[PDB]
Nanobody, 126 residues
């Protein structure tokens, strides 16, 4: 099983981006997947997460009303849509997965996810 991310790149401030995290086969299709980011010089922080059983999402205060997750069942892929991008959104974005659900407390702890994509760099510049 592997998680493969795509969609990183250079993005203008105020702009939007869509990251994808494709899981091998049918992995995690009813479990939980999340997005974390690692800014320069910093440890990873959570961005958003989804319980694929039901579809409830959870998000960091910094992205509420800005960053949303969508799901493509046929491709076993989840997407992070991010709009109104700020320079401070610059970071390596990782997708993560775990067997079993997450909740409004547990989704934010990176150690709760044993599966990780390679990370994709997002650079927000004018």
């Amino acid at each position: 099983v592997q998680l493969v991310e795509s969609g990183g790149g250079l993005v203008q401030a105020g702009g939007s981006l869509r990251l994808s995290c494709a899981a091998s086969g049918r992995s995690f299709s009813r479990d939980a997947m999340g997005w974390f980011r690692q800014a320069p010089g910093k440890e990873r922080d959570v961005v958003a997460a989804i319980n694929l059983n039901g579809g409830r999402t959870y998000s960091a205060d910094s992205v509420k009303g800005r960053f949303t997750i969508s799901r493509d069942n046929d491709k076993n892929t989840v997407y992070l849509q991010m709009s109104n991008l700020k320079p401070e959104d610059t970071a390596v974005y990782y997708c993560a997965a775990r067997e079993g659900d997450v909740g409004l407390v547990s989704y934010k702890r990176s150690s709760n996810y044993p599966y990780w994509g390679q990370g994709t760099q997002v650079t927000v510049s004018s």
